[PDB]
């Protein structure tokens, strides 16, 4: 069952074995991935998060972010630790009480403290549209049509040794999959369809790191949504999906009744499908209960290319149709050296006082805000452009902005910008060496919004800044509940800060 939009959500420690290997985890709702949180566009979500964590090896504090939901007027509910709140301590709870006006699509929720989401605190978050303009393109859209892609590690996130390369041990599709080494024939996920019907498959990357080449043998996929933004129909036979991105695609159950491999090839970790790694099963009703015998092509015919996507609505691009044609045009210097990432020379280290609380306490320019050099002010009611030139090690880096989606004026691997009809989204690959991926948005959401790489290991190593959007109006725009005011005193007392 889906839960919400008003629900409790308990965060616990438990053992799981999603690839046959047992390890402790941090779970929402007792499962990996967590249960789907759902409602309709415009609903009031009231998610009372109970922190019941006791195992310090995965941190006993927590904080949860509702990835891709704008939180206008509720910045305090956004979740990034030390950006919008202090963490919730064990034995306490916190009500994330917010609304989702003007948004409908496929989202997710995840811990936003340290690398804790990698230890298991990740799940889907769907905001349905009772008047969805795409409704007539499919028959079925429910919990059974959500597809999550996850990296899974045998080593605990806090225990990943300093100076050793971090790669995953299994790809999990809907929570199940097989380990890349010492592979055992543990159960694979099955996604069931009925011959003749059409499905809105909601593909969610809950990855901490790898991007996946996602495909379904014998089938193609008609993209209708990108990171919450309705798109024109785009038929592809493979989707490269980066950490934290989402697509909805129409799957037409138009192949012979049978079993077909679902493939999700990560860019690191195990390569290929030996022993059924990187795999799940598409099973038609009435098919034999057996593994598929299908194969992938050597070369896919119609891979997704991001510049092929266009909004369903006439979204345009704000500003003027040339580089720098914005009220506040930025170019960020994104670098890596010696184990740390930096943005314009500053590596992000979370501050003791959350940025939002610093602002509410009267800090009124970004030079006054901690961490020094990590908080950049944005002016209100302005077109912002951010160029994100690639080159830093560990790419391709999927950058994400809280509080906003954005026009992708320039995409990976293509030097030509698009000032007419590019897709809008919230997480974008910045590509490869010499690329100049560039985003645009307008500032109509006062508050501190995190901009960061969504490879969690990179975020932890400093690949972030905070955009303090409209500092002057942040306090008036975001009244805070007493429970939020109580978070930092409780956290600092428990931690003897
Ligand atoms: C690299 O990125 C650019 C910019 O996003 C892509 O250019 C765009 O390509 C499309 C598809 O060919 C062009 O639109 C087409 O416009 C013609 C009118 O000439 C119309 O008849 C077609 O039906 C279609 O809509 C679009 O104008 C063009 N935009 C720009 C700014 O150049 C390009 O395709 C990407 N390269 C690759 C290899 O995908
Ligand atoms: C990415 O695009 C930005 C503009 O959006 C480029 O920024 C210019 O950088 C040069 C120095 O390299 C400056 O003289 C200009 O003032 C910048 N702004 C402009 C022209 O609008 C940036 O160089 C591009 N980066 C790459 C790697 O292509
Ligand atoms: Cu987010
Ligand atoms: Cu996120
Ligand atoms: Cu990164
Ligand atoms: Cu985030
Ligand atoms: F977000």
Coordinates of C-alpha atoms and ligand atoms in Angstrom, one line a residue:
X1 CA 0.0 0.0 0.0
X2 CA 1.0 3.6 -0.6
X3 CA 0.9 5.9 2.4
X4 CA 0.1 9.5 2.8
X5 CA -0.4 12.3 2.3
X6 CA -0.9 12.3 6.1
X7 CA 1.2 9.5 7.6
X8 CA 3.6 8.5 10.3
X9 CA 7.0 7.2 9.0
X10 CA 9.2 5.3 11.4
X11 CA 13.0 5.2 10.7
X12 CA 14.6 2.0 12.1
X13 CA 17.5 -0.2 12.0
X14 CA 17.1 -3.8 10.7
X15 CA 19.0 -6.4 8.8
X16 CA 18.2 -7.0 5.2
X17 CA 19.5 -9.2 2.5
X18 CA 18.4 -7.8 -0.9
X19 CA 21.1 -9.6 -2.8
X20 CA 21.4 -12.6 -0.4
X21 CA 24.1 -10.9 1.7
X22 CA 22.9 -9.8 5.2
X23 CA 23.7 -6.4 6.6
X24 CA 22.2 -3.8 8.9
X25 CA 20.4 -0.9 7.3
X26 CA 18.5 2.4 8.0
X27 CA 14.9 1.9 6.8
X28 CA 11.8 3.9 6.4
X29 CA 8.7 1.9 6.9
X30 CA 10.6 -1.3 7.6
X31 CA 11.5 -2.0 4.0
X32 CA 14.1 -1.2 1.2
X33 CA 13.2 0.8 -0.6
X34 CA 10.8 2.6 1.7
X35 CA 7.1 2.6 1.1
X36 CA 5.7 5.0 -1.5
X37 CA 4.5 8.2 -0.1
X38 CA 1.7 9.5 -2.3
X39 CA -1.0 12.1 -2.8
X40 CA -2.6 14.4 -5.4
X41 CA -1.4 17.7 -6.7
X42 CA -1.9 20.5 -4.3
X43 CA -2.3 18.2 -1.3
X44 CA -1.1 18.9 2.2
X45 CA 1.5 16.3 3.2
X46 CA 2.0 15.8 6.9
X47 CA 4.8 13.2 7.3
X48 CA 5.5 12.6 10.9
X49 CA 9.0 11.1 10.9
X50 CA 9.8 9.0 14.0
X51 CA 13.5 8.6 14.5
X52 CA 13.8 5.2 16.2
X53 CA 17.5 4.6 15.2
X54 CA 19.8 3.0 17.7
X55 CA 22.8 1.8 15.7
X56 CA 25.5 4.5 15.6
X57 CA 27.4 2.8 12.8
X58 CA 24.8 4.4 10.4
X59 CA 24.2 7.5 12.5
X60 CA 21.3 7.7 15.0
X61 CA 20.3 11.1 13.9
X62 CA 18.3 11.6 10.7
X63 CA 16.7 14.2 8.4
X64 CA 14.6 13.6 5.3
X65 CA 14.3 15.6 2.1
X66 CA 11.4 15.4 -0.3
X67 CA 13.4 15.5 -3.5
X68 CA 12.0 17.8 -6.2
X69 CA 9.2 19.3 -4.2
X70 CA 9.7 23.0 -4.1
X71 CA 8.7 23.8 -0.4
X72 CA 7.6 27.3 -1.2
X73 CA 6.9 29.0 2.1
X74 CA 8.0 25.8 4.0
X75 CA 11.8 25.9 3.5
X76 CA 12.1 24.6 7.1
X77 CA 10.6 21.3 5.9
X78 CA 13.1 20.7 3.0
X79 CA 15.4 18.4 5.0
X80 CA 19.1 19.0 4.1
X81 CA 20.9 18.8 7.4
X82 CA 22.5 22.1 8.4
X83 CA 21.0 23.8 5.5
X84 CA 17.3 24.0 6.5
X85 CA 17.3 22.1 9.9
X86 CA 19.3 20.4 12.6
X87 CA 18.8 16.6 12.4
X88 CA 16.1 14.8 14.4
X89 CA 17.6 12.9 17.3
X90 CA 16.7 9.4 18.3
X91 CA 13.6 8.9 20.3
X92 CA 12.0 12.0 18.8
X93 CA 9.8 12.8 15.9
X94 CA 9.1 15.7 13.6
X95 CA 6.2 16.6 11.4
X96 CA 7.2 17.6 7.9
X97 CA 4.0 19.6 7.1
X98 CA 4.0 21.1 3.6
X99 CA 1.9 21.5 0.4
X100 CA 2.6 20.6 -3.2
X101 CA 0.8 23.3 -5.3
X102 CA 1.5 23.3 -9.0
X103 CA 3.5 20.0 -9.0
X104 CA 2.5 16.6 -10.2
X105 CA 4.8 13.8 -11.1
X106 CA 7.4 11.3 -9.9
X107 CA 9.6 12.3 -6.9
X108 CA 11.4 10.5 -4.1
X109 CA 12.4 10.9 -0.5
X110 CA 15.8 10.3 1.1
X111 CA 17.9 10.9 4.2
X112 CA 19.8 14.2 3.7
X113 CA 22.3 13.7 6.6
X114 CA 25.8 12.5 5.6
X115 CA 25.8 9.4 3.4
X116 CA 22.9 7.9 5.4
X117 CA 20.5 7.5 2.4
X118 CA 23.0 5.0 1.0
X119 CA 22.4 2.8 4.1
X120 CA 18.8 2.5 3.1
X121 CA 16.6 5.5 3.8
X122 CA 15.2 6.1 0.3
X123 CA 11.8 5.6 -1.3
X124 CA 9.4 6.8 -4.0
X125 CA 7.2 9.9 -3.6
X126 CA 4.4 10.3 -6.2
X127 CA 2.1 13.2 -6.7
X128 CA -0.7 12.1 -9.0
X129 CA -2.7 14.5 -11.2
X130 CA -6.5 13.8 -11.3
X131 CA -6.5 15.8 -14.6
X132 CA -3.2 14.5 -15.9
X133 CA -2.8 15.6 -19.6
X134 CA -1.1 12.3 -20.3
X135 CA -3.9 10.2 -18.7
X136 CA -5.2 8.8 -22.0
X137 CA -1.8 7.4 -23.0
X138 CA -2.0 4.5 -20.5
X139 CA -4.3 2.2 -18.6
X140 CA -2.5 1.4 -15.4
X141 CA -0.5 3.7 -13.1
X142 CA -0.2 2.6 -9.4
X143 CA 2.3 1.1 -7.0
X144 CA 2.9 -1.8 -9.3
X145 CA 4.2 0.5 -12.1
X146 CA 7.0 2.2 -10.0
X147 CA 10.5 0.9 -10.9
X148 CA 13.3 1.9 -8.5
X149 CA 17.0 1.6 -9.4
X150 CA 19.4 1.4 -6.5
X151 CA 23.0 0.8 -5.8
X152 CA 23.6 -1.4 -2.8
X153 CA 26.8 -1.7 -0.8
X154 CA 28.0 -4.5 1.6
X155 CA 30.3 -2.0 3.5
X156 CA 28.4 0.5 5.6
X157 CA 28.4 4.1 4.4
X158 CA 30.2 5.4 7.4
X159 CA 32.7 2.6 7.2
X160 CA 33.9 3.1 3.6
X161 CA 37.6 3.4 4.2
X162 CA 39.4 6.7 3.5
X163 CA 41.4 6.6 0.3
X164 CA 39.9 3.4 -1.2
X165 CA 37.6 3.5 -4.3
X166 CA 33.9 3.2 -3.5
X167 CA 31.8 0.9 -5.7
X168 CA 28.6 -0.9 -5.1
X169 CA 28.1 -4.6 -4.6
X170 CA 24.7 -5.1 -6.3
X171 CA 22.2 -3.3 -8.5
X172 CA 18.7 -3.6 -6.9
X173 CA 15.6 -3.2 -9.1
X174 CA 12.5 -2.8 -6.9
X175 CA 14.7 -3.8 -4.0
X176 CA 16.1 -7.0 -5.3
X177 CA 19.0 -8.1 -7.4
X178 CA 22.2 -10.1 -7.3
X179 CA 25.7 -9.4 -6.1
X180 CA 28.5 -8.7 -8.5
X181 CA 31.0 -10.9 -6.7
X182 CA 30.1 -14.2 -4.9
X183 CA 26.9 -14.0 -6.9
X184 CA 24.1 -16.1 -5.6
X185 CA 20.8 -16.9 -7.2
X186 CA 18.7 -14.8 -4.9
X187 CA 15.3 -13.7 -6.0
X188 CA 14.9 -11.2 -8.8
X189 CA 12.1 -8.6 -9.0
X190 CA 9.2 -9.3 -11.2
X191 CA 7.1 -6.6 -12.9
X192 CA 3.9 -8.1 -14.2
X193 CA 1.9 -6.8 -17.1
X194 CA -1.2 -8.0 -19.0
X195 CA -1.0 -8.4 -22.8
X196 CA -2.7 -5.5 -24.6
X197 CA -2.6 -3.0 -21.7
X198 CA -0.5 0.1 -21.4
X199 CA 1.4 1.1 -18.2
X200 CA 2.8 4.4 -16.9
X201 CA 6.1 3.1 -15.6
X202 CA 7.6 5.5 -13.1
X203 CA 11.3 5.0 -13.2
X204 CA 13.1 6.4 -10.2
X205 CA 16.8 6.5 -9.7
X206 CA 17.4 6.3 -5.9
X207 CA 21.1 5.9 -6.6
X208 CA 23.9 7.1 -4.3
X209 CA 26.3 7.1 -7.3
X210 CA 26.0 5.2 -10.5
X211 CA 24.1 6.1 -13.5
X212 CA 22.2 3.2 -15.2
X213 CA 21.6 2.2 -18.8
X214 CA 18.0 1.0 -18.4
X215 CA 16.2 -1.1 -21.0
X216 CA 13.6 -3.8 -21.4
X217 CA 14.3 -6.6 -23.9
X218 CA 11.8 -6.6 -26.8
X219 CA 10.2 -3.4 -25.7
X220 CA 10.5 0.3 -26.2
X221 CA 9.6 3.1 -23.8
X222 CA 7.7 6.3 -24.6
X223 CA 8.9 9.1 -22.2
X224 CA 6.1 11.3 -20.9
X225 CA 7.6 12.9 -17.8
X226 CA 11.1 14.1 -16.8
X227 CA 11.8 14.8 -13.1
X228 CA 8.2 15.9 -12.5
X229 CA 7.9 17.8 -15.8
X230 CA 5.4 16.5 -18.4
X231 CA 7.1 15.9 -21.8
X232 CA 6.1 15.4 -25.3
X233 CA 6.1 11.7 -26.1
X234 CA 9.7 10.5 -26.9
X235 CA 10.1 6.8 -27.8
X236 CA 13.5 5.3 -26.9
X237 CA 14.8 1.8 -26.4
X238 CA 17.4 2.7 -23.7
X239 CA 17.4 5.4 -20.9
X240 CA 20.7 6.5 -19.3
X241 CA 19.4 7.7 -15.9
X242 CA 21.6 9.5 -13.5
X243 CA 21.4 9.6 -9.7
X244 CA 18.1 11.1 -8.4
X245 CA 16.5 11.5 -11.9
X246 CA 13.0 10.2 -12.7
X247 CA 11.2 9.4 -16.0
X248 CA 7.7 8.2 -16.6
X249 CA 7.4 6.1 -19.7
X250 CA 4.6 4.3 -21.4
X251 CA 5.2 0.5 -21.7
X252 CA 2.9 -1.1 -24.2
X253 CA 2.5 -4.8 -23.3
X254 CA 2.6 -5.5 -27.1
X255 CA 5.0 -8.4 -27.3
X256 CA 4.2 -12.1 -27.1
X257 CA 3.2 -13.4 -23.7
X258 CA 6.4 -14.4 -22.1
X259 CA 9.4 -13.3 -19.9
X260 CA 11.7 -10.4 -20.9
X261 CA 14.8 -9.2 -19.1
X262 CA 14.7 -5.7 -17.5
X263 CA 18.3 -4.4 -17.6
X264 CA 20.0 -1.7 -15.5
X265 CA 23.7 -1.4 -16.2
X266 CA 25.6 0.8 -13.8
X267 CA 28.6 2.8 -15.0
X268 CA 30.7 1.3 -12.2
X269 CA 30.5 -2.1 -10.4
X270 CA 29.6 -5.2 -12.3
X271 CA 29.5 -5.1 -16.0
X272 CA 27.1 -7.3 -17.9
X273 CA 24.4 -9.7 -16.7
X274 CA 26.3 -12.9 -15.8
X275 CA 24.3 -14.9 -13.2
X276 CA 21.5 -12.4 -13.4
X277 CA 23.2 -9.4 -12.0
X278 CA 21.9 -6.0 -13.1
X279 CA 18.5 -7.6 -14.0
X280 CA 14.9 -8.0 -13.2
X281 CA 12.0 -9.8 -15.0
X282 CA 9.1 -8.4 -17.0
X283 CA 6.5 -11.2 -16.9
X284 CA 3.3 -11.2 -18.8
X285 CA 0.2 -12.7 -17.2
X286 CA -0.1 -16.3 -18.4
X287 CA 3.7 -16.7 -19.0
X288 CA 5.6 -19.6 -17.6
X289 CA 7.3 -18.8 -14.3
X290 CA 10.9 -19.0 -15.6
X291 CA 13.7 -16.6 -16.4
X292 CA 13.7 -14.7 -19.7
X293 CA 15.8 -16.1 -22.5
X294 CA 15.9 -12.7 -24.4
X295 CA 19.1 -10.9 -25.3
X296 CA 19.9 -7.2 -25.6
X297 CA 21.0 -5.8 -28.9
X298 CA 24.7 -5.0 -29.4
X299 CA 23.8 -1.5 -30.1
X300 CA 20.6 0.3 -29.1
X301 CA 18.6 1.9 -31.8
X302 CA 17.1 4.9 -30.1
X303 CA 18.9 5.8 -26.9
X304 CA 17.6 8.8 -24.9
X305 CA 19.5 12.0 -25.7
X306 CA 18.5 14.8 -23.4
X307 CA 18.2 17.4 -26.2
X308 CA 15.5 15.3 -27.8
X309 CA 13.2 15.9 -24.8
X310 CA 10.8 18.9 -24.8
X311 CA 8.1 20.0 -22.4
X312 CA 4.5 19.1 -23.0
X313 CA 3.5 22.7 -22.0
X314 CA 4.9 25.8 -23.6
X315 CA 7.5 26.5 -20.9
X316 CA 10.1 28.3 -22.9
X317 CA 13.3 29.6 -21.3
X318 CA 13.6 32.7 -19.2
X319 CA 16.0 35.5 -20.0
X320 CA 17.6 36.2 -23.3
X321 CA 18.7 33.8 -26.0
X322 CA 22.5 33.9 -25.5
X323 CA 25.1 33.0 -22.9
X324 CA 24.9 35.4 -20.0
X325 CA 21.5 36.6 -21.0
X326 CA 20.1 36.6 -17.4
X327 CA 19.8 39.0 -14.6
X328 CA 22.3 37.0 -12.5
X329 CA 24.5 34.9 -14.8
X330 CA 26.9 32.6 -12.9
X331 CA 29.7 30.3 -14.0
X332 CA 30.8 27.9 -11.3
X333 CA 34.3 26.5 -11.1
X334 CA 33.7 22.9 -10.1
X335 CA 36.9 21.1 -9.0
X336 CA 38.3 18.0 -7.2
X337 CA 41.6 17.5 -5.6
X338 CA 43.1 15.5 -2.8
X339 CA 39.8 13.8 -1.8
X340 CA 37.7 17.0 -1.7
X341 CA 35.4 18.7 -4.1
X342 CA 35.1 22.4 -4.3
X343 CA 32.9 25.1 -5.9
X344 CA 34.6 28.4 -6.6
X345 CA 37.5 27.2 -4.4
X346 CA 35.4 26.3 -1.4
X347 CA 34.7 22.8 -0.2
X348 CA 31.3 22.4 1.5
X349 CA 31.5 21.4 5.2
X350 CA 28.1 21.6 6.9
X351 CA 27.9 24.5 9.4
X352 CA 26.9 24.1 13.1
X353 CA 24.0 26.4 12.8
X354 CA 21.7 25.6 9.8
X355 CA 21.8 28.3 7.1
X356 CA 18.0 28.9 7.5
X357 CA 18.4 29.5 11.2
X358 CA 21.3 31.8 10.7
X359 CA 19.1 33.9 8.3
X360 CA 16.2 33.9 10.7
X361 CA 18.5 35.1 13.5
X362 CA 19.3 38.2 11.3
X363 CA 22.3 37.4 9.2
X364 CA 21.4 39.4 6.2
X365 CA 24.0 38.9 3.5
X366 CA 25.6 35.9 2.2
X367 CA 29.2 37.0 3.2
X368 CA 27.8 36.9 6.9
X369 CA 26.6 33.3 6.4
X370 CA 28.4 30.2 7.4
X371 CA 30.1 28.3 5.9
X372 CA 32.1 31.2 4.5
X373 CA 32.2 31.2 0.8
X374 CA 29.7 28.3 0.6
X375 CA 26.5 30.5 0.6
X376 CA 25.8 32.6 -2.5
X377 CA 22.9 35.1 -2.5
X378 CA 20.4 35.3 -5.2
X379 CA 18.2 38.3 -5.9
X380 CA 14.4 38.0 -5.9
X381 CA 12.3 37.9 -9.0
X382 CA 15.3 37.5 -11.3
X383 CA 16.4 35.2 -14.1
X384 CA 19.4 33.1 -12.9
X385 CA 21.7 31.3 -15.2
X386 CA 24.2 28.8 -13.9
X387 CA 26.9 27.3 -16.1
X388 CA 28.4 24.1 -14.7
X389 CA 31.4 23.2 -16.8
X390 CA 32.5 19.6 -16.3
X391 CA 36.0 18.2 -15.8
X392 CA 36.2 17.4 -12.1
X393 CA 37.1 13.8 -11.4
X394 CA 34.5 11.2 -10.7
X395 CA 32.0 12.4 -13.4
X396 CA 29.6 12.5 -15.0
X397 CA 28.2 14.5 -12.1
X398 CA 24.4 14.8 -11.7
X399 CA 23.8 18.3 -10.3
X400 CA 20.6 19.0 -8.5
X401 CA 19.0 22.2 -7.1
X402 CA 16.5 22.1 -4.2
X403 CA 13.5 24.4 -4.3
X404 CA 13.3 24.6 -8.1
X405 CA 13.3 23.0 -11.4
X406 CA 15.2 24.6 -14.3
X407 CA 15.5 24.8 -18.0
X408 CA 18.4 22.7 -19.3
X409 CA 19.8 25.3 -21.8
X410 CA 22.7 23.1 -22.6
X411 CA 23.1 19.4 -22.1
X412 CA 26.0 16.9 -21.9
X413 CA 28.0 16.1 -24.9
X414 CA 26.5 18.8 -27.2
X415 CA 27.9 22.3 -27.4
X416 CA 24.8 23.9 -28.7
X417 CA 22.5 25.7 -26.3
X418 CA 18.7 25.7 -26.6
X419 CA 16.9 28.9 -25.7
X420 CA 13.6 27.8 -27.2
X421 CA 12.3 24.5 -25.9
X422 CA 14.6 22.5 -23.8
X423 CA 13.4 20.1 -21.2
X424 CA 13.0 21.4 -17.6
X425 CA 14.1 19.1 -14.8
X426 CA 15.7 19.1 -11.4
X427 CA 18.8 16.9 -11.7
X428 CA 21.1 17.1 -14.7
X429 CA 24.3 15.4 -15.8
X430 CA 27.0 18.0 -16.4
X431 CA 28.7 15.7 -18.9
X432 CA 32.3 15.3 -19.7
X433 CA 35.5 17.3 -20.2
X434 CA 34.9 20.6 -22.1
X435 CA 31.1 20.5 -21.7
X436 CA 29.2 23.5 -20.5
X437 CA 25.9 22.2 -19.1
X438 CA 23.8 25.3 -18.2
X439 CA 20.6 25.8 -16.3
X440 CA 18.2 28.7 -15.9
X441 CA 15.3 29.5 -13.5
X442 CA 13.6 32.5 -12.0
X443 CA 13.8 33.3 -8.3
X444 CA 10.2 33.2 -6.9
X445 CA 10.9 31.0 -3.8
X446 CA 12.7 32.7 -0.9
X447 CA 15.0 30.5 1.2
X448 CA 18.3 28.7 1.3
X449 CA 18.4 26.1 -1.5
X450 CA 21.1 23.4 -1.7
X451 CA 22.8 23.0 -5.1
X452 CA 24.9 19.8 -5.1
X453 CA 26.2 16.8 -6.9
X454 CA 23.8 13.9 -6.3
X455 CA 26.6 11.3 -6.1
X456 CA 26.3 11.1 -2.3
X457 CA 30.0 10.3 -1.8
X458 CA 30.8 13.6 -3.7
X459 CA 28.3 15.7 -1.6
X460 CA 29.9 14.3 1.6
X461 CA 33.3 15.3 0.1
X462 CA 32.2 18.9 -0.3
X463 CA 30.6 19.2 -3.8
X464 CA 27.9 21.7 -2.9
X465 CA 26.9 25.4 -2.3
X466 CA 23.8 27.0 -0.8
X467 CA 21.9 29.6 -2.9
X468 CA 20.4 32.0 -0.3
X469 CA 17.5 33.1 -2.5
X470 CA 16.0 36.4 -1.4
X471 CA 17.5 36.6 2.0
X472 CA 15.4 39.7 2.8
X473 CA 12.1 37.9 2.4
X474 CA 13.2 34.5 3.8
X475 CA 11.8 35.1 7.3
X476 CA 8.5 36.5 6.3
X477 CA 8.0 33.8 3.6
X478 CA 8.8 30.8 5.8
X479 CA 7.2 31.0 9.2
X480 CA 8.5 28.2 11.3
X481 CA 6.7 25.9 13.7
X482 CA 7.8 25.5 17.3
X483 CA 8.9 21.9 16.7
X484 CA 11.4 23.2 14.1
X485 CA 12.7 25.8 16.5
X486 CA 13.2 23.0 19.0
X487 CA 15.3 20.9 16.7
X488 CA 18.7 22.6 17.1
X489 CA 18.6 23.0 20.9
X490 CA 17.7 19.3 21.2
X491 CA 20.4 18.2 18.7
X492 CA 23.1 20.4 20.2
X493 CA 22.3 19.2 23.7
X494 CA 22.4 15.6 22.7
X495 CA 25.7 16.1 20.9
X496 CA 27.2 18.4 23.6
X497 CA 27.6 21.2 21.1
Ligands
LIG1 C1 22.4 19.3 -30.0 O1 21.6 20.2 -29.3 C2 20.9 21.1 -30.1 C3 20.2 22.1 -29.3 O2 19.3 21.5 -28.3 C4 20.0 20.3 -31.0 O3 19.5 21.2 -32.0 C5 18.2 21.2 -32.2 O4 17.9 20.1 -33.1 C6 16.5 20.0 -33.4 C7 16.3 18.7 -34.1 O5 16.9 18.7 -35.4 C8 16.1 21.3 -34.2 O6 14.6 21.3 -34.3 C9 14.1 20.9 -35.6 O7 13.8 22.2 -36.1 C10 13.4 22.0 -37.4 C11 13.4 23.4 -38.0 O8 14.7 23.6 -38.6 C12 12.0 21.3 -37.5 O9 11.6 21.1 -38.8 C13 12.2 19.9 -36.9 O10 11.0 19.2 -36.9 C14 12.8 20.0 -35.5 O11 12.0 20.6 -34.5 C15 16.3 22.5 -33.4 O12 16.1 23.7 -34.2 C16 17.8 22.5 -32.9 N1 18.0 23.7 -32.1 C17 19.1 24.4 -32.1 C18 19.3 25.5 -31.2 O13 20.0 24.2 -32.9 C19 20.7 19.1 -31.7 O14 19.8 18.3 -32.4 C20 21.6 18.4 -30.7 N2 22.4 17.4 -31.4 C21 22.2 16.1 -31.5 C22 23.1 15.3 -32.3 O15 21.2 15.6 -30.9
LIG2 C1 30.4 28.2 -20.2 O1 29.6 29.3 -20.5 C2 29.9 30.5 -19.8 C3 28.8 31.6 -20.0 O2 27.5 31.0 -19.7 C4 31.3 31.0 -20.2 O3 31.6 32.1 -19.4 C5 32.4 33.1 -19.9 O4 33.8 32.8 -19.5 C6 34.8 33.7 -20.0 C7 36.1 33.1 -19.6 O5 36.3 31.7 -19.9 C8 34.4 35.1 -19.5 O6 35.3 36.0 -20.2 C9 33.0 35.5 -19.7 O7 32.7 36.7 -18.9 C10 32.0 34.4 -19.3 N1 30.5 34.8 -19.6 C11 29.9 34.9 -20.8 C12 30.7 34.9 -22.1 O8 28.7 35.1 -20.9 C13 32.3 29.9 -19.9 O9 33.6 30.2 -20.4 C14 31.9 28.6 -20.6 N2 32.8 27.5 -20.2 C15 33.2 26.5 -20.9 C16 34.1 25.5 -20.3 O10 32.9 26.4 -22.1
LIG3 CU1 16.3 17.9 -3.7
LIG4 CU1 18.2 14.8 -3.5
LIG5 CU1 29.8 14.1 -8.4
LIG6 CU1 19.5 17.3 -2.0
LIG7 F1 14.8 18.9 -4.3

